[PDB]
Design a protein around this nucleic acid. Structure first.
Ligand SMILES: [Mg+2]
Ligand SMILES: [Mg+2]
Ligand SMILES: [Mg+2]
Ligand SMILES: [Mg+2]
Ligand SMILES: [Mg+2]
Ligand SMILES: [Mg+2]
Ligand SMILES: [Mg+2]
Ligand SMILES: [Mg+2]
Ligand SMILES: [Mg+2]
Ligand SMILES: [Mg+2]
Ligand SMILES: [Mg+2]
Ligand SMILES: [Mg+2]
Ligand SMILES: [Mg+2]
Ligand SMILES: [Mg+2]
Ligand SMILES: [Mg+2]
Ligand SMILES: [Mg+2]
Ligand SMILES: [Mg+2]
Ligand SMILES: [Mg+2]
Ligand SMILES: [Mg+2]
Ligand SMILES: [Mg+2]
Ligand SMILES: [Mg+2]
Ligand SMILES: [Mg+2]
Ligand SMILES: [Mg+2]
Ligand SMILES: [Mg+2]
Ligand SMILES: [Mg+2]
Ligand SMILES: [Mg+2]
Ligand SMILES: [Mg+2]
Lengths: 80, 63, 143, 198, 145, 30, 67, 89, 69, 142
RNA sequence: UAAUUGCGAUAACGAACGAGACCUUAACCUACUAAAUAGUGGUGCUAGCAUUUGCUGGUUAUCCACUUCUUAGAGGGACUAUCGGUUUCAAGCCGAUGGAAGUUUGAGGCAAUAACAGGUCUGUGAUGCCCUUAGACGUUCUGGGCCGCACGCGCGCUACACUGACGGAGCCAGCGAGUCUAACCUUGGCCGAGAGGUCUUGGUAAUCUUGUGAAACUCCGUCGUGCUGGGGAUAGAGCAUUGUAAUUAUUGCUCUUCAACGAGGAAUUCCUAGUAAGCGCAAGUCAUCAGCUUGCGUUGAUUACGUCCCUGCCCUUUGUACACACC
């Protein structure tokens, strides 16, 4: 003890980090918010948090449990 | 022992259903003005010579 | 003028030093050179019944001379070839260790090698000249 | 002949006998012409080489194999039948022996023996799969080397002969169209199948 | 330069340990005709009989002949170390042997009766014609015969 | 035990090869 | 085969269009000229462009070309 | 004194290679600037499926580690995360 | 049926035939005569005693000899 | 005193062959031994080639010290043959005039078996699915 | 064109994803910054042959110098350059010339949209629901089994030998791994046919193992076309090693037993340059056990530089009663 310390930092531009905005969606789904507007809300957040693009995707049992996967995305991404 | 002698001067194209053979026109190398077109087996280039005897039958496209 | 082993042909050198050592007849071979095959790697013993140990000893001397020092270990790898494992694949296996050691041991009661520091034997001053001299003769194997 | 020499030995079978004419191992390239023609500049016997081993890069464009000595591609065509593959060293040794055997079976010039071997080796026209066609000056040489090295290779397998003799054997053999030549045995008996079918 | 003539001294078709060995094979290998002798044994049993290995069986006259037979029957008494021998630590006597030409299959068949009789695993499998060194059977040893 | 097997006849190898192999051993692709 | 992508083509025409008097028919000169009058993020790109520009150049000076 | 230096960032540890190379000798002490050692590549090869089914497809991850040896209170002149730093006498 | 070791009902052939060949090698012998080969190698080695054969090159596997000097 | 030398190398695929060439009288040694002794020895002519192709005599006010590492028994001899050919023109550049240099340089390249350019060929990397880089494992379909 | 790659044609014009670019790795740098954990030259010290001064060695710093070889930072370098031939004289294809390099430079990493009831709950303290939860389908202990053998199938290893086997000798890689509350990689000495044993040693490693003196291979010999000294399956006997424990043999060693196999039917796999093929090697696994895999280097070619005949895919045209889409 004493040879180990921690510090803190508020996040800079909490929209431009996709783990802050990963649990973003874990949590308002833990508040049950409707899948589409749930996703559409976080992408409409990190779109004009100053990101060239953004895409949020989720797969599973939306509509009573046949498995689907809807994807929500705005802006510009590359993949290559 | 009638043996020809024919240098090519151009390679008309690609015959054989599998692309096996080319065609070429040749000059008979003693009386140079006769020129005949025939097809080959190996890789050929411009100006190579060949040895045959079938100094007619002038063959053409082939399935 | 100025003969050094490094200027001789490898094989015929060692093939003549094996005869100089058999002639000189005072290099101490052990009592089992009739019964052994020089590596688990091999299948048959060397069909040069009597000679073979002299060949080996000679070739060794010639090797430690051009190296700096050579331990019994490294010699076992040099001489060991590939084993034939039957219906399995051939991998490299070393040479007998008592053979190699007993020649390196019997090569200092002749004065040709001597226990270098860092381990292993090294060449000797006597050895250095014996070979530097024994080269010049088969060197002049031209009249 | 400029018999110069420096500190190191520099022996005298070499100091002169190729500085003055830089030939094959001890064998001369001059006045050995490619008697048969229309196969010249495809058989390379006129850019002298000593050992049938180069850092060759012959297989990048189609016909760089042409400017390859007929020898070093005759030696390549040996190390085959895969347990032999990639042993160029053994192959050069095989040939250096064969050239000596032919030179004491017929006290000719031995690379004339080899080119005079492949004159009548490769077909002058051939069968193919539906009628006859004609053969290119390079699938003459190439199948020629093939059918003969395969003849000398298969002649020695279970027979007490070596592979220097069988090679020299199948070489003067097809070097006088002798009809004891696996090469011309296929070659004599697959052209007449070429003028017959049509 | 052993071009030498070797007239009718050259003993054709010799016989030994109730066997026959062709006189035309080099000695060290001509010996391996005999169940019990391998190339490594027949190398040194011939070294201890002052045999000129360079030669072969029709040669190597009858004194060198029983000069090797005896080194073979008593290898342990001719500077031949024990490891070199095929049957050591016998299991009934405890000496070091080399079972030999007709006696190899005998004391092998004895070794199999040996443990068939004690009804132990190795022996059971030996009796079933099965394979006794733990290998797989599902795939191998097909065409049993 | 083992004596219950060793001299339990009818259980060696020609007691196997005697019988043909069940012809349902080359039959697959459900 | 070696055929030039649109990114290295449209950039070559875009250069010639408004720098013609200050280019010329040598790669190495245009190669170096590019590093100032335009931002490129990779060297092989830079060279690929400078090479097509130059290929264009040698032919525009043997006649005008469509675009 | 000898400073062996080792880090997993080619860029962020020629920082101190540079910030003592002649922070030494604008301050005029020493030479034998950075002696760069073989970059150790730590390769790990493994399949991609976590089950066994599928085309038998392999991956290999590298981890490169650069070390440099340049021969008590420019200790803390040289603090950048991810750059490991030691001494010897 | 070859002849492993010298018979000598088939030896005097070894000098009354060696120049009929202009090429001598272990195989030329076993092909033409019924020498073993094993010692034929030393037939040529020995036959090179006085030089009733001419050495032109020799090698671990191939020996090429030519009708005498 | 420090004898004036230039220094070159020769490369065939893994073999690096350093070569020191100073002003001397005849020493030509690969791996500390006379050049006449390299014994793969079908190829001994492939190490001799540079000397005869250019003329035995320009090697009198010479000396070559070569030692080779890497590759195998044949790639080392090729790294040798051109580690020294690449040095006889570094010594005719540093210490002699030019025209002579680009006369023997051209004497080689009239002939060049990679004799003063590195053969760039190198091993392709293996990939999963076969034993080689293009060799692929075999399979069944049923 | 490898490419929806481009030239063009154009009721389209202008663009985004993918391809390309990008990134890594192998190739050139006598040009920059450099070095006892890398080399090199000289120099002290020194050994041997010579003596004619020289050739070849030993000294971890004797002292100096240096950066060619080596390592790795910062850059340079290729753009298919130049010239010629075909060409809408367009994108481009080909030829020679130089050039380390001119086949997307070689090789890879990445990789769009949409989709399959493909695989995985036996990777997960990822998981819903059913199941079971103390005569437990939780867990732990002893022993057994996953390998059990009339047989069908798949991947392989070893071979049929003379372009070989064996004996001796020559001897050359690269990719890599390695011991703190520790027993890893192990030189060297000694002992043992061997396998192994024992006493020391270096190394948390460009520093010690290690020049990993690997194998193929090369040379010189013995054998000499004979299921032969090719081949090494099965099996008997013994000696060691790991391990609580080796029986149903873990592996290694030694002698003895010497099978099928004399080029493999119908059918069929992979392959275009340092490639195929051969050869070994490290790493994964691992107390022990590789005939497996992942990579490395050594030796190193024949044939192609084409076609759509065959299988497969792509685009277009076309038919359609299919849309759970020809299962
Ligand atoms: Mg003993
Ligand atoms: Mg070795
Ligand atoms: Mg060996
Ligand atoms: Mg084997
Ligand atoms: Mg097993
Ligand atoms: Mg040296
Ligand atoms: Mg490989
Ligand atoms: Mg497009
Ligand atoms: Mg893109
Ligand atoms: Mg140093
Ligand atoms: Mg020094
Ligand atoms: Mg060129
Ligand atoms: Mg690249
Ligand atoms: Mg399913
Ligand atoms: Mg899972
Ligand atoms: Mg499982
Ligand atoms: Mg299982
Ligand atoms: Mg598989
Ligand atoms: Mg054997
Ligand atoms: Mg051998
Ligand atoms: Mg003992
Ligand atoms: Mg046998
Ligand atoms: Mg027994
Ligand atoms: Mg392992
Ligand atoms: Mg496995
Ligand atoms: Mg492997
Ligand atoms: Mg429709």
């Amino acid at each position: 003890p004493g040879t180990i310390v921690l510090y803190a930092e508020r996040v800079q531009d909490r929209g431009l980090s996709a783990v802050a905005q990963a649990e973003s969606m874990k949590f308002k789904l833990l508040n049950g918010l409707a899948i589409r507007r749930a996703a559409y809300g976080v992408v409409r957040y990190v779109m004009e948090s100053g990101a060239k693009g953004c895409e949020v995707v989720v797969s599973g049992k939306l509509r009573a449990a046949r498995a689907k996967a809807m994807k929500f995305a705005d802006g510009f991404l590359i993949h290559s | 022992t009638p043996v020809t002698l024919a240098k090519v001067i151009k390679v008309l194209g690609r015959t054989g259903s599998r692309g096996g053979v080319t065609q070429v026109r040749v000059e008979f190398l003693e009386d140079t003005s006769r020129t005949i077109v025939r097809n080959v087996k190996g890789p050929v280039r411009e100006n190579d010579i060949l040895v045959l005897m079938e100094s007619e039958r002038e063959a053409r496209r082939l399935r | 003028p100025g003969v050094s082993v490094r200027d001789v042909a490898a094989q015929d050198f060692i093939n003549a030093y094996a005869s100089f050592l058999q002639r000189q007849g005072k290099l101490e071979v052990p009592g089992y050179v009739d019964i052994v095959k020089t590596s688990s790697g091999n299948e048959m013993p060397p069909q040069d019944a009597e000679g073979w140990f002299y060949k080996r000893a000679a070739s060794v001397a010639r090797h430690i001379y051009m190296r700096k020092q050579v331990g019994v270990g490294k010699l076992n790898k040099l001489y060991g070839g590939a084993k034939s494992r039957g219906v399995r694949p051939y991998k490299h296996i070393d040479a007998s260790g008592s053979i190699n050691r007993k020649v390196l041991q019997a090569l200092e009661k002749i004065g040709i090698v001597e226990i270098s520091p860092k381990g292993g034997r090294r060449i000797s001053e006597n050895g250095q000249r014996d070979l530097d001299r024994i080269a010049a003769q088969t060197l002049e194997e031209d009249e | 002949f400029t018999p110069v020499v420096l500190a190191t030995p520099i022996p005298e079978e070499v100091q002169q006998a190729q500085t003055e004419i830089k030939l094959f191992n001890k064998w001369s390239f001059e006045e050995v012409e490619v008697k048969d023609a229309s196969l010249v500049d495809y058989v390379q016997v006129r850019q002298p080489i000593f050992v049938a081993h180069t850092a060759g890069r012959y297989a990048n464009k189609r016909f760089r194999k042409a400017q390859c000595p007929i020898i070093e591609r005759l030696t390549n065509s040996l190390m085959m039948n895969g347990r032999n593959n990639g042993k160029k060293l053994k192959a050069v040794r095989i040939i250096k022996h064969t050239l000596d055997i032919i030179n004491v079976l017929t006290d000719q010039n031995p690379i004339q023996v080899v080119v005079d071997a492949i004159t009548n080796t490769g077909p002058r026209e051939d069968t193919t799969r539906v009628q006859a066609v004609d053969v290119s000056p390079l699938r003459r040489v190439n199948q020629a080397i093939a059918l003969l090295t395969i003849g000398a290779r298969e002649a020695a397998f279970r027979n007490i002969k070596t592979i220097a003799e069988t090679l020299a054997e199948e070489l003067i053999n097809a070097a006088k169209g002798s009809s004891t030549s696996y090469a011309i045995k296929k070659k004599d008996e697959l052209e007449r199948v070429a003028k017959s079918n049509r | 330069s052993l071009v030498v003539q070797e007239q009718g001294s050259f003993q054709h078709i010799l016989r030994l340990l109730n066997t026959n060995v062709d006189g035309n094979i080099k000695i060290v290998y001509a010996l391996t005709t005999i169940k019990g002798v391998g190339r490594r044994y027949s190398n040194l049993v011939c070294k201890k009989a002052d045999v000129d290995l360079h030669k072969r069986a029709g040669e190597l006259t009858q004194e060198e002949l029983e000069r090797i037979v005896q080194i073979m029957q008593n290898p342990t008494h001719y500077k031949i170390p024990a490891w070199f021998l095929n049957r050591q630590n016998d299991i009934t006597d405890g000496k070091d042997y080399h079972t030999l030409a007709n006696n190899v299959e005998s004391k092998l068949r004895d070794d199999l009766e040996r443990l068939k009789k004690i009804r132990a695993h190795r022996g059971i499998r030996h009796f079933w014609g099965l394979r006794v060194r733990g290998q797989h059977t599902k795939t191998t040893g097909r065409r049993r015969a | 035990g083992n004596e219950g097997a060793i001299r339990d006849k009818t259980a060696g190898r020609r007691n196997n090869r005697s019988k043909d192999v069940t012809d349902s051993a080359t039959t697959k692709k459900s | 085969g070696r055929v030039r992508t649109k990114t290295v083509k449209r950039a070559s025409k875009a250069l010639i269009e408004r720098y013609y008097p200050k280019l010329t028919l040598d790669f190495q000169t245009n190669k170096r000229l590019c590093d100032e009058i335009a931002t490129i993020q990779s060297k092989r790109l830079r060279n690929k462009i400078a090479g097509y520009t130059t290929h264009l150049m040698k032919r525009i000076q043997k006649g005008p070309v469509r675009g | 004194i000898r400073i062996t230096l080792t880090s997993t960032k080619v860029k962020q540890l020629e920082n101190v290679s540079s910030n003592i190379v002649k922070n030494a000798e604008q301050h005029n002490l020493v030479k034998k600037g950075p002696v760069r050692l073989p970059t150790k590549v730590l390769k790990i090869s493994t399949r991609k499926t976590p089950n066994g089914e599928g085309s038998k497809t392999w991956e290999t991850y590298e981890m490169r580690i650069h070390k440099r040896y340049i021969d008590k209170r420019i200790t803390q002149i040289t603090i950048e995360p991810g750059v490991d730093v030691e001494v010897v006498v | 049926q070859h002849a492993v070791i010298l018979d000598q009902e088939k030896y005097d052939r070894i000098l009354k035939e060696v120049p009929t060949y202009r090429y001598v090698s272990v195989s030329v012998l076993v092909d033409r005569l019924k020498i073993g080969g094993s010692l034929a190698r030393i037939a040529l080695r020995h036959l090179e005693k006085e030089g009733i054969i001419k050495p032109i090159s020799k090698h671990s596997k191939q020996a090429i000899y030519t009708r005498a000097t | 005193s420090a004898v004036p030398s230039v220094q070159t190398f020769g490369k065939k695929k893994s073999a690096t062959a350093v070569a020191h060439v100073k002003a001397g009288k005849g020493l030509i040694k690969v791996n500390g031994s006379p050049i006449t002794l390299v014994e793969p020895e079908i190829l001994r002519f492939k190490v001799y080639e540079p000397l005869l192709l250019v003329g035995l005599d320009k090697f009198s006010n010479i000396d070559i010290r070569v030692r080779v590492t890497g590759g195998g028994h044949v790639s080392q001899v090729y790294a040798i043959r051109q580690a020294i050919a690449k040095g006889l023109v570094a010594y005719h550049q540093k210490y002699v005039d030019e025209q002579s240099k680009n006369e023997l340089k051209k004497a080689f390249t009239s002939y060049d078996r990679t004799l003063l350019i590195a053969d760039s060929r190198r091993p392709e990397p293996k990939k999963f699915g076969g034993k080689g880089a293009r060799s692929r494992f075999q399979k069944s379909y049923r």
